């Protein structure tokens, strides 16, 4: 406002909000390894 | 008069017995983890 002295200060705006949603999806990965691969193959294929 | 008399059933469920001669028990086995064995052998001898 820069109220004044003498001035009877009336309302002031508000700031008005916004909701914005993020709808969190989902991203899949399904490999396929050989049972007789995980044991035969030192490194760790699990964790690779 | 029948439904009385209902036939007994042996208490376990039989088989043809078959050989057990494997050929496992004059060769040499060996435990393995991994996909393979191999053996290094001499197919030749030295000179003198």
Redesign the interface.
């Known amino acids: 406002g820069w109220a004044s002295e003498t001035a009877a200060l009336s309302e002031t705006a508000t700031p008005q909000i916004d909701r914005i949603t993020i709808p969190l999806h989902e991203l899949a990965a399904m490999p396929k390894a050989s049972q007789?691969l995980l044991?035969?193959?030192a490194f760790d294929i699990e964790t690779w | 008069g029948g439904y009385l008399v209902d036939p007994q059933t042996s208490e376990t469920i039989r088989g043809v017995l078959r050989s057990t001669a494997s050929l496992r028990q004059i060769a040499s086995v060996v435990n393995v983890?991994?996909?393979?064995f191999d053996v290094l052998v001499d197919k030749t001898d030295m000179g003198s």
Do not use: M
């Open positions: 007789r044991d035969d193959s | 983890e991994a996909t393979s």
